[PDB]
Amino acid sequence: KIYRPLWEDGAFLMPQQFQQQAAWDVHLADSVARMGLAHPWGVVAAEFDDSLLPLSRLNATRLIVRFPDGTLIDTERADNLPPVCDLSTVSDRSLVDIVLALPLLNANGGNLDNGSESERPRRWKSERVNVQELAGHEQSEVAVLRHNLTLRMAHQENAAWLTCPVTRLVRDAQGQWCRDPRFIPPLLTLSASPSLMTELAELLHHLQARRQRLMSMRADVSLFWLLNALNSAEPVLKELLDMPYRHPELLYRELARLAGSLLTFSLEHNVDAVPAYHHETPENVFPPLLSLLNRLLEAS
Amino acid sequence: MKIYRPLWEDGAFLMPQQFQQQAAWDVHLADSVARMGLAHPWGVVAAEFDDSLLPLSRLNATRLIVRFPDGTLIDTERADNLPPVCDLSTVSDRSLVDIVLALPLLNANGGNLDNGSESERPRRWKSERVNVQELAGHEQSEVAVLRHNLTLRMAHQENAAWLTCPVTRLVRDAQGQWCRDPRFIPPLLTLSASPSLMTELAELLHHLQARRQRLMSMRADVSLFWLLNALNSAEPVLKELLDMPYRHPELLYRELARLAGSLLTFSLEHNVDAVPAYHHETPENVFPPLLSLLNRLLEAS
Amino acid sequence: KIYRPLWEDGAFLMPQQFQQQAAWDVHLADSVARMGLAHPWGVVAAEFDDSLLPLSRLNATRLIVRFPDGTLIDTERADNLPPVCDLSTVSDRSLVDIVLALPLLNANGGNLDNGSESERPRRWKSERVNVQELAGHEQSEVAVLRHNLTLRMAHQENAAWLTCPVTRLVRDAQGQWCRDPRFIPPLLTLSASPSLMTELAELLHHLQARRQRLMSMRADVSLFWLLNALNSAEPVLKELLDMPYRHPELLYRELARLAGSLLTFSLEHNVDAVPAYHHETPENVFPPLLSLLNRLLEA
Amino acid sequence: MKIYRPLWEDGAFLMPQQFQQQAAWDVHLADSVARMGLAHPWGVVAAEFDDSLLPLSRLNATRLIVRFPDGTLIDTERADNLPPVCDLSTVSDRSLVDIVLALPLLNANGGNLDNGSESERPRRWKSERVNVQELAGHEQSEVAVLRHNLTLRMAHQENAAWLTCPVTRLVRDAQGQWCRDPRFIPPLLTLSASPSLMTELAELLHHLQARRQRLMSMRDVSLFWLLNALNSAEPVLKELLDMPYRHPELLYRELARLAGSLLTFSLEHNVDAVPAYHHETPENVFPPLLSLLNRLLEAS
Amino acid sequence: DRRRIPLKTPLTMRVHHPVSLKSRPVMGDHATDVNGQVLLQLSTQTGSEVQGWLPGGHLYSDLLALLHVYLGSRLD
Secondary structure (H helix, E strand, O other): OOOOOOOOOOOEEOOHHHHHHHHHHHHHHHHOOOOOOOOOOOEOOOOOEEHHHHHHHHEEEEEEEOOOOOOOOOOOHHHHHHHHOOOOHHHHOOOOEEEEEOOOOOOOOEEOOOOOOOOOOEEEEEEEEEEEEOOOOOEEEEEEEOOOOEEEEOOOOOOOEEEEEEEEEOOOOOOOOOOOOOOOOOOOOOOOOHHHHHHHHHHHHHHHHHHHHHHHHHHHHHHHHHHHHHHHHHHHHHHHHOOOOHHHHHHHHHHHHHHHHHOOOOOOOOOOOOOOOOOOOHHHHHHHHHHHHHHHHHOO | OOOOOOOOOOOOOOOOOHHHHHHHHHHHHHHHHOOOOOOOOOEEEEEEOOHHHHHHHEEEEEEEEOOOOOOOOEEEOOOOOOOOOOEHHHOOOOOOEEEEEEEOOOOOOOOOOOOOOOOOOOOOOEEEEEEEEOOOOOEEEEEEEEEEOOOOOOOOOOOOOEEEEEEEEEEOOOOOOOOOOOOOOOOOOOHOOOOOHHHHHHHHHHHHHHHHHHHHOOOOOHHHHHHHHHHHHHHHHHHOOOOOOOOHHHHHHHHHHHHHHHOOOOOOOOOOOHHHOOOOOOOOOHHHHHHHHHHHOOOOO | OOOOEEOEEEEOOHHHHHHHHHHHHHHHHHHHOOOOOOOEEEEEEEEEEEEHHOOOOEEEEEEEEEEEOOOOEEEEOOOOOOOEHHHHHHEEEEEEEEEEEEEOOOOOOOEEEEOOOOOOOOEEEEEEEEOOOOOOOOEEEEEEEEOEEEEEEEEOOOOOEEEEEEEEEOOOOOOEEEEOOOOOOOOOOHHHHHHHHHHHOHHHOHHHHHHHHHOOOOOOOOHHHHHHHHHHHHHHHHHHOOOOOOHHHHHHHHHHHHHHHHOOOOOOOOOOOOOOOOOOOHHHHHHHHHHHHHHHHHO | OOOOOOOOOOOOOOHHHHHHHHHHHHHHHHHHHHHOOOOOOEEEEEEEEEHHHHHEEEEEEEEEEEEEEOEEEEEEOOOOOOOOOOOOHHHHOEEEEEEEEEEEEEOOOOEEEEEOOOOOOOOOEEEEEEEEOOOOOOOOEEEEEEEOOEEEEEEOOOOEEEEEEEEEEEEEOOOOOEOOOOOOOOOOOOHOHHHHHHHHHHHHHHHHHHHHHHHHHHHHHHHHHHHHHHHHHHHHHHHHHHHOOOOOOHHHHHHHHHHHOOOOOOOOOOOOOOOOOOOOOOHOOOHHHHHHHHHHHHHO | OOOOOOOOOOOEEOOOOOOOOHOOOOOOOOOOOOOOOOOOOOOOOHHHHHHOOOOOHHHHHHHHHHHHHOOOOOOO
16 A cells, blocks of 8 residues: 655656655654564653643643554644643543544545545644755745644544543542543653652662662572572663663563562462553553562562 | 765756655665664565465465565565466476575666566566555546565575575475475564464463473472572563564574573583574574473473 | 645645655654664764874774764765864874764754855755666766764864764874774674674683583582573573674673672672663773673682 | 845945845834734724725725735835726625735745736736935935735635735625625724724713713612722723724723623623634624623613 | 746646656756856956946947847847
8 A cells, every 4th residue: 555656767746656655664664663562652741731620621731652553743843732622521420531543544535634524534734834944044835744633532432543542530529620640651661651750760779778688688598599689680670760761661571570580489479470561551560560579579 | 885865955956866865765774773673684574375276386475575684675465566476387306495585686787677678687676557546635646656576486596686585485295296384484574474483482381381380389499499480580571572473583582592591500411502593594493493492491390 | 843744736846845854754763763772872883094093194984873863974875984183283192082073953054064164063065976876777966965074082172063982092102193992982883892892702701611610510509500690691692792783782781680690699799880881981881891790700 | 034134344345135135124123023012013004995986896995004914014105006906897796705905925036026027926016116306405316116016806716825914895785786894894903994993982982981970970899890890991991092093902901801890790691701802803803892891881 | 157047837746747857847946047148257457448348338338239249149
């Protein structure tokens, strides 16, 4: 479905050539990412304005998202923010899952939004922007392509859209809306979740503290191997957390190995205690893995 | 082979070279990125063949996805055409033959487009007219489309003028008819590209887990403690790698190699050099022996 | 900001569309690299002709480097070599750090060098080259872009340029300038610096020699533990060193694990004997860690 | 559109570029100053037409004073020409047609002067030779004077190459003849530009004063609140209407404050009834705001 | 001698009737012309000659009068 152009001799300057090259370029970049990572997509940033929740309105302030088909959204560098989401029609619910949606590409054309009405949502918008040339001095207007982004509810029909979680809202004791204190979207960059950063920092601290106690102290076989497990794991876990801008898959593997070894010392639990990695629902991966590690280290 | 970054000067003559060079750079950049993490970022992703006419000396492909070691990606599912049918009539004198996917070299001196003329060297590019619809609007028209000149050649043939990557092996059956070799592994870019290896890996994980449970049941016995640890450490990672078999083999090899290394600390009969070096071009000499070794070692206790 | 162009029937063809498209694609590629690599930038090649150092001249022969902001320099394929550096003004010094300098982008345009002078150095240069059309059998002269690269010394003002170390020159016994045998540029590819490969090779050798000596001896906790640690590491380190063509980050993690384990039984070293990874200054990472490993192993 | 302010040295050539660029800068500065206090420093100051020939499908402007969105001031009384007569014969099919004043966009690459040739892009400038009297002395001579290529265009037709500003609306009367819309308002720069608005504002003031005087005579905090609001606003609204030669933004704010206060005690009106200010479409700002105020005053 | 030539139409992208590179197209504002003009540079050694060559002078007029016939419509 991607027709790479043939730029030879008397080529014709057709708009299709440019569109097809762009499609390939994205595909190629995506193919490369997939060589090392199972899930090269997810959230990088998802900052929202909390001051509108008291007035039943949700408005993103900064979104950086990579979709399952290599599409890259960046409202800091190239994209516009989505329209304000009216929660009035969702009022009946006590819990709301909000996702970022982008309409699917239409292979049969009609992708550009020309203001007309259609049964299938348009995904592209045309904006006129005055853009400065880099090489020379001349300044002029061009047609800039923007994504037709919007916020939708998880419980709504989303057949025509690509989408991923960005935030969850719950009702507080006073009945007002508040972002769920412990929500994690599918992450692309580890640092995308501030709460995860905090928990990981605590883990590293406790790991090091236990290490130092056992290290100073050095039945003696268990001591040596428990210590070994910590001495081996700490140097790498530290590096992973010191510069926390990597895909979660790398961290998961390292943490999983540590949990594995520690379960060799404990008889109070199972051996399949370590959860499988799930990209879409990281909430069931990291929070329990980290809890397991903390408990095992404490048990020592 | 130079790659230029063209200057899009306003008012200058617009030239076909500008487009060719711009595209080349973008491909180069993508290749450069891949090489930062993986030593051998190329190989087979898909190699599905139609053997229905194989009994009649005809082999054909249904879906080929291969990354060639010059940054070129060939994809007959969404970007390219399937190669011509391989005629095995002149191969009947052999008991075993390998088939490689051949892609003509890109000549820096030009003449890379196939104009139907006779030449001492193969052309990489072909010109196809395709009725392509515009995405933004509704309009549709015929535009020239580049297709790569792919062909299936035998490994024993002269292949100096082509980049090659193995895709399948044929052997003679009991009846003298051709059939596909049940145990053939091409250079892999993804694990899922080879069902054979994938099956063996799944079996390994099963045995690994089964043996682990026995050791747990039995838990100054340093031998058990040492070994049990090694298994519990390995499984949480090996499982993930196999659950989603869409990663470069280097990642799997590394993890398995560590397990083999640890297990060879217990076995006295096996030598320390039992673990094979990684070779990308011929995975058959890497995984099949590594996997056999791991099974033999696990069975030790 | 990057403004992705909208291609459509009736649209005008403009140089701004091409320039913005290029920026986007570079950005996208950089994004992918960062999924697995903490520091995608660094040196790939820094080969110099040092035969002219006796005549106060430093002449680069092949430079390949990715800059901190994704800019890729490739002498072999796309860029020209910088002018020869005149060392006659270094007479009063005994040690000079040489970096490759690249002017930074002008947000408001005027990036191309038009031959005029200005307070802020231009980044791009226009050249005319002969390019062969790949499809057919014809050649023509076209305009291409080159980066305005130059060699500068660390002790000079370098505010207007992004810089990356490429070589260090030290006075020899004869008073002559020579390349420092123990200098490591921030590396992107291990093979970029032979000095490091050599030390790594020695480590691998010693590990194998020690492992064999221990293995032949097969209260045994220390023996079994040490063999386990060495046997586990060997199959991995081997591969990483056999093919020294990847980001050093991967090697660091593996070496760190080995040092981490060995320190468990060692008494003569501090708990934090393993150094942090400092991408900008490998000289404060690798030789330290390697020296540690050699001592831990010999012990 | 870069502006290259000229330098004058010890001795040099004079050049067309120096004069053209200096003028551009000075215009820029004037525009910059206006924007310090006013969000929308552009619009119609005056617009008058000769309706004598309107029954014969001819729209003949007699006076136009319009400040354009890009700092360009057109004044056909003091320093410019009137546009050609618009032929309405081509829109006979429609019951309503909007007319805008169009000014061709400046070409950054030159070719702005109309040399009498035809081209796709409309030219911006015309050269007219007139006799200009020297102020200091008693001599006069021919000088090339810049005039703008002004024209009236149908609002519904493609106007991509022109910067436009609405000046009048025509409708079909009972007799099938064209006439001017009794209640049309262009983007205003000064209140005096639209007599219809002035009339309604005058009526408001009258009613306001009457309400005030009656309530003052008849003398519960509601009494005082309504009276206070009237007494506070009146001294200011009066002055604004006495000298109706200022930007609408000033008037809007005063009227908005009044509506705001009045709505405090109303129990049948929406507090959000007050419209947002829209410069392009003032018809949706003042007419409803004024209607709201009238209702609020009546609802004593 | 180089002169800039205005274009009748800008360079645009189309589907039904696209531009072929055989036309050697350029961006839509201006094209170059290096086959339509020559440059004739003069230099004098006295004020008399200069005044004659300046616009309004008799040498300026005479030269154009001769070019009218000698070059005619061939070149500017």
